[PDB]
Backbone as a chain_set.jsonl record, in Angstrom:
{"seq": "XXXXXXXXXXXXXXXXXXXXXXXXXXXXXXXXXXXXXXXXXXXXXXXXXXXXXXXXXXXXXXXXXXXXXXXXXXXXXXXXXXXXXXXXXXXXXXXXXXXXX", "coords": {"N": [[4.369, 32.122, 1.58], [1.564, 30.586, 0.19], [2.157, 28.043, -0.949], [4.368, 27.112, 0.485], [4.906, 25.336, 2.377], [4.469, 23.068, 0.645], [5.169, 19.515, 0.13], [6.907, 16.701, -1.035], [5.575, 13.401, -1.263], [5.65, 11.799, 2.059], [6.655, 8.795, 3.627], [6.046, 8.062, 6.795], [5.489, 5.474, 8.13], [6.215, 2.28, 7.232], [5.484, -0.468, 5.35], [5.442, -3.516, 6.475], [7.254, -6.531, 5.674], [5.889, -9.981, 5.705], [4.591, -13.298, 7.019], [1.727, -15.093, 5.952], [-0.479, -17.811, 6.691], [-1.698, -19.983, 4.547], [-4.821, -19.469, 2.997], [-5.766, -17.561, 4.96], [-6.604, -14.217, 5.815], [-5.236, -11.259, 5.086], [-3.197, -8.269, 5.869], [-1.436, -5.029, 4.898], [-0.279, -2.26, 6.339], [0.436, 1.386, 5.9], [1.775, 4.694, 6.57], [1.249, 7.78, 4.923], [2.462, 11.17, 4.81], [1.577, 14.27, 3.097], [1.811, 17.126, 1.322], [0.286, 18.828, -1.242], [-2.225, 16.407, -0.754], [-1.716, 13.289, -1.242], [-1.927, 11.232, -4.687], [-2.496, 7.713, -4.68], [-1.115, 4.68, -5.403], [-1.784, 1.262, -5.925], [0.052, -2.021, -6.275], [0.669, -5.383, -7.267], [3.31, -7.621, -7.716], [4.17, -5.656, -9.674], [1.829, -5.321, -11.233], [-1.047, -3.136, -11.362], [-3.257, -2.803, -8.652], [-6.598, -3.25, -8.385], [-9.723, -2.284, -6.536], [-11.674, -5.101, -5.316], [-13.464, -8.261, -4.881], [-11.445, -9.863, -3.8], [-9.5, -8.05, -2.958], [-8.979, -5.419, -0.934], [-8.223, -1.92, -0.503], [-7.9, 0.793, 1.777], [-7.886, 4.455, 2.547], [-7.528, 6.888, 4.571], [-6.942, 9.974, 5.283], [-4.398, 9.745, 5.081], [-3.487, 7.42, 6.239], [-2.963, 4.486, 5.085], [-4.446, 1.452, 4.161], [-4.039, -2.076, 2.849], [-5.4, -4.907, 2.172], [-5.444, -8.551, 1.714], [-7.841, -10.843, 0.777], [-8.383, -14.531, 1.487], [-5.648, -15.933, 1.137], [-3.761, -17.257, -1.259], [-0.93, -19.136, -2.896], [-0.661, -17.756, -5.3], [-0.834, -14.943, -4.299], [1.41, -14.533, -3.1], [4.489, -12.535, -3.049], [5.561, -9.267, -4.418], [4.133, -6.171, -2.681], [3.101, -2.952, -3.524], [2.884, 0.25, -2.678], [2.383, 3.308, -4.144], [2.95, 6.758, -3.668], [2.107, 9.797, -5.004], [2.601, 13.284, -5.831], [2.765, 16.685, -6.803], [5.23, 17.45, -6.026], [6.437, 15.458, -5.738], [7.381, 11.821, -5.488], [7.04, 9.088, -3.236], [8.016, 5.851, -2.62], [6.646, 2.65, -1.39], [7.618, -0.92, -0.63], [6.693, -4.012, 0.378], [7.003, -7.6, 1.023], [4.978, -10.538, 0.491], [4.545, -13.466, 2.079], [3.067, -16.451, 1.604], [2.31, -19.463, 3.406], [2.058, -22.833, 4.854], [-0.6, -24.115, 6.523]], "CA": [[3.518, 31.715, 0.439], [0.616, 29.42, 0.47], [2.563, 26.66, -1.302], [5.857, 26.88, 0.85], [4.879, 24.021, 2.866], [4.051, 21.816, -0.139], [6.372, 18.994, -0.176], [6.663, 15.494, -1.889], [5.112, 12.382, 0.033], [6.862, 11.319, 3.034], [6.086, 7.905, 4.233], [6.443, 7.701, 8.32], [5.346, 4.435, 8.451], [6.376, 1.642, 6.26], [4.646, -1.56, 5.363], [5.913, -4.833, 7.102], [6.909, -8.194, 5.067], [5.432, -10.793, 6.724], [4.069, -14.215, 6.73], [0.384, -15.63, 6.216], [-0.985, -18.945, 6.493], [-2.505, -20.297, 3.153], [-6.342, -19.144, 3.359], [-5.942, -16.209, 6.046], [-6.636, -13.032, 5.155], [-3.801, -10.46, 5.72], [-3.083, -6.722, 5.739], [-0.192, -4.377, 4.875], [-0.323, -0.763, 6.759], [1.468, 2.417, 5.899], [1.143, 5.98, 6.67], [2.002, 8.912, 4.189], [2.566, 12.571, 4.829], [1.762, 14.967, 1.481], [1.035, 18.472, 0.945], [-0.769, 18.65, -1.25], [-2.486, 15.188, -0.335], [-1.163, 12.473, -2.593], [-2.377, 10.345, -5.183], [-1.869, 6.378, -4.355], [-1.645, 3.327, -6.305], [-1.181, -0.326, -5.209], [0.621, -3.214, -7.235], [1.364, -6.593, -6.955], [4.19, -7.867, -8.725], [4.218, -5.05, -10.819], [0.613, -4.802, -11.899], [-1.617, -2.021, -10.334], [-4.471, -3.501, -7.67], [-8.301, -2.594, -8.1], [-10.889, -2.817, -5.553], [-12.283, -6.327, -5.674], [-13.891, -9.424, -3.881], [-10.174, -10.276, -3.038], [-8.552, -7.051, -2.864], [-9.737, -4.026, -0.616], [-7.647, -0.703, 0.3], [-8.496, 2.052, 2.085], [-7.225, 5.584, 2.614], [-8.16, 7.776, 5.396], [-6.146, 10.785, 5.853], [-2.818, 9.266, 4.785], [-3.311, 6.128, 6.518], [-3.409, 3.584, 4.037], [-4.272, -0.121, 4.291], [-4.279, -3.105, 1.823], [-6.391, -6.058, 2.559], [-6.135, -9.465, 0.777], [-8.66, -12.102, 1.406], [-8.202, -15.876, 1.242], [-4.368, -15.927, 0.337], [-3.079, -18.633, -1.59], [0.309, -18.972, -3.177], [-0.606, -16.662, -6.185], [-0.908, -13.955, -3.712], [2.625, -14.145, -2.587], [5.355, -11.61, -3.788], [5.842, -7.976, -3.785], [2.901, -5.231, -2.635], [3.934, -1.665, -3.433], [2.411, 1.553, -2.719], [3.021, 4.546, -4.682], [2.137, 8.089, -3.394], [2.492, 10.983, -5.756], [1.849, 14.816, -5.893], [3.168, 17.551, -7.915], [6.664, 17.907, -5.551], [7.615, 14.252, -6.345], [6.861, 10.697, -5.13], [7.223, 8.062, -2.334], [7.263, 4.338, -2.704], [7.008, 1.524, -0.444], [7.327, -2.207, -1.059], [6.812, -5.273, 1.127], [6.891, -9.093, 0.619], [4.157, -11.485, 1.273], [4.87, -15.034, 2.172], [1.971, -17.339, 2.027], [2.647, -20.395, 3.807], [1.557, -23.652, 5.277], [-1.594, -23.474, 7.637]], "C": [[2.571, 30.571, 0.566], [0.985, 27.897, -0.228], [3.895, 26.536, -0.502], [5.95, 25.785, 1.449], [4.379, 23.029, 2.005], [5.241, 20.966, 0.176], [5.96, 17.377, -0.654], [6.267, 14.304, -0.645], [5.893, 12.015, 0.754], [5.97, 10.295, 3.822], [6.606, 7.615, 5.829], [6.213, 6.551, 8.692], [5.679, 3.506, 7.553], [5.696, 0.384, 6.296], [5.886, -2.647, 6.253], [5.942, -6.233, 6.558], [6.453, -8.828, 6.172], [4.796, -12.259, 5.827], [2.676, -14.438, 6.775], [0.125, -17.139, 5.726], [-1.815, -19.126, 5.276], [-4.302, -20.248, 3.594], [-6.769, -18.092, 4.164], [-6.052, -15.259, 5.063], [-5.436, -12.295, 5.683], [-3.805, -8.873, 5.333], [-1.768, -6.055, 5.685], [-0.724, -2.729, 5.244], [1.069, 0.271, 6.451], [0.728, 3.751, 6.17], [2.07, 7.139, 5.844], [1.316, 10.23, 4.551], [2.559, 13.335, 3.632], [1.241, 16.272, 1.513], [1.564, 18.904, -0.405], [-0.971, 17.019, -1.232], [-2.324, 14.594, -1.639], [-1.891, 11.775, -3.034], [-1.71, 8.972, -4.848], [-2.465, 5.432, -5.104], [-0.888, 2.414, -5.965], [-0.766, -1.066, -6.226], [0.894, -4.323, -6.413], [1.945, -7.152, -8.006], [4.169, -7.245, -9.917], [2.944, -4.327, -11.322], [-0.432, -3.853, -10.971], [-3.167, -2.751, -9.913], [-5.62, -2.57, -8.004], [-8.847, -3.217, -6.865], [-11.442, -4.076, -6.128], [-12.786, -6.961, -4.75], [-12.764, -9.792, -2.978], [-9.422, -9.2, -2.372], [-9.383, -5.717, -2.015], [-8.659, -3.033, 0.155], [-8.445, 0.071, 0.787], [-7.336, 3.163, 2.329], [-7.695, 6.456, 3.401], [-7.072, 8.811, 5.902], [-4.352, 10.403, 5.775], [-2.362, 7.837, 5.271], [-4.064, 5.12, 5.715], [-3.064, 2.062, 4.372], [-4.737, -0.918, 3.099], [-4.729, -4.178, 2.484], [-6.281, -7.109, 1.382], [-6.424, -10.607, 1.426], [-8.282, -13.478, 0.884], [-6.788, -16.227, 0.678], [-4.074, -17.142, 0.117], [-1.656, -18.257, -2.474], [0.441, -17.807, -4.649], [-0.462, -15.361, -5.727], [0.531, -13.546, -2.962], [3.286, -13.176, -3.444], [5.306, -10.042, -3.309], [4.613, -7.176, -3.855], [3.73, -4.098, -2.719], [2.971, -0.665, -3.655], [3.048, 2.716, -3.188], [2.389, 5.82, -4.412], [2.714, 9.064, -4.488], [1.769, 12.241, -5.643], [2.805, 15.563, -6.55], [4.644, 18.001, -7.561], [7.278, 16.653, -5.646], [6.843, 12.832, -5.885], [7.664, 9.693, -3.919], [6.982, 6.5, -2.379], [7.774, 3.431, -1.427], [6.884, 0.156, -0.825], [7.604, -3.144, -0.037], [6.709, -6.419, 0.529], [5.978, -10.114, 1.5], [4.566, -12.91, 1.052], [3.9, -15.934, 2.659], [2.425, -18.737, 2.542], [1.696, -21.458, 4.105], [0.61, -23.446, 6.336], [-0.772, -23.401, 8.964]], "O": [[2.991, 29.564, 1.137], [0.313, 26.873, -0.098], [4.62, 25.663, -0.98], [6.944, 25.091, 1.238], [3.826, 22.069, 2.541], [6.292, 21.532, 0.478], [4.801, 16.966, -0.603], [6.588, 14.346, 0.542], [7.019, 11.809, 0.302], [4.955, 10.576, 4.459], [7.605, 6.91, 5.974], [6.733, 6.315, 9.782], [5.314, 4.033, 6.502], [5.256, 0.094, 7.409], [7.046, -2.324, 6.511], [5.046, -7.047, 6.779], [6.54, -8.432, 7.334], [4.59, -12.386, 4.62], [2.194, -13.929, 7.786], [0.446, -17.577, 4.621], [-2.68, -18.275, 5.07], [-4.824, -20.985, 4.431], [-7.933, -17.689, 4.152], [-5.747, -15.326, 3.872], [-4.752, -12.715, 6.616], [-4.525, -8.457, 4.425], [-0.915, -6.506, 6.449], [-1.468, -2.108, 4.485], [2.261, 0.05, 6.669], [-0.482, 3.951, 6.064], [3.265, 7.358, 6.045], [0.106, 10.447, 4.61], [3.566, 13.159, 2.947], [0.046, 16.388, 1.782], [2.711, 19.223, -0.72], [-0.042, 16.316, -1.631], [-2.61, 15.05, -2.746], [-2.752, 11.352, -2.263], [-0.485, 8.954, -4.722], [-3.638, 5.243, -5.424], [0.317, 2.48, -5.725], [-1.285, -0.743, -7.294], [1.244, -4.323, -5.233], [1.384, -7.256, -9.097], [4.152, -7.821, -11.005], [2.884, -3.161, -11.713], [-0.434, -4.056, -9.757], [-4.006, -3.136, -10.728], [-5.574, -1.344, -7.907], [-8.555, -4.285, -6.327], [-11.672, -4.139, -7.336], [-12.705, -6.445, -3.635], [-12.883, -10.001, -1.77], [-8.778, -9.404, -1.342], [-10.334, -5.144, -2.546], [-8.276, -3.314, 1.291], [-9.61, 0.164, 0.401], [-6.135, 2.894, 2.319], [-8.596, 7.055, 2.813], [-6.366, 8.512, 6.865], [-3.408, 10.861, 6.419], [-1.346, 7.223, 4.944], [-5.276, 4.919, 5.639], [-1.993, 1.553, 4.701], [-5.683, -0.536, 2.41], [-4.267, -4.294, 3.619], [-6.786, -6.871, 0.285], [-5.777, -11.245, 2.256], [-7.833, -13.503, -0.262], [-6.817, -16.884, -0.362], [-4.068, -18.038, 0.961], [-1.388, -17.072, -2.671], [1.466, -17.186, -4.929], [-0.016, -14.528, -6.516], [0.723, -12.481, -2.376], [2.77, -12.922, -4.532], [5.081, -9.654, -2.163], [3.928, -7.295, -4.871], [4.841, -4.054, -2.192], [2.276, -0.651, -4.671], [4.119, 3.113, -2.73], [1.28, 6.014, -4.908], [3.913, 8.968, -4.75], [0.563, 12.316, -5.406], [3.805, 14.933, -6.894], [5.306, 18.692, -8.336], [8.507, 16.583, -5.649], [5.615, 12.845, -5.969], [8.894, 9.684, -3.857], [5.872, 5.999, -2.193], [8.806, 3.461, -0.757], [5.859, -0.033, -1.48], [8.728, -3.132, 0.465], [6.286, -6.367, -0.626], [6.104, -10.433, 2.682], [4.868, -13.391, -0.04], [3.798, -16.227, 3.85], [3.178, -19.196, 1.684], [0.535, -21.263, 3.746], [0.923, -22.58, 7.153], [-1.288, -22.949, 9.986]]}, "num_chains": 1, "name": "protein.A"}
């Protein structure tokens, strides 16, 4: 059948928790495989993230990137990507530790 190969999102490359010196820009990367293609939502400490001068995420054929610019203490904490399709969901979280330069 046309929907036999449909499957819940599968994250094959997960985000890496990491440190960044205060003031630098930093990135999280993950890769999801999903049929049909999954909806993607980003969160910082539980609150859904939007594109802004501070936050830029991309999504190219499942390759997902989140950039945070000019990192300060407020930017520390948990970043979570949640990938959803009708078959199920996959979530990945990682921690950003903003440190001294």
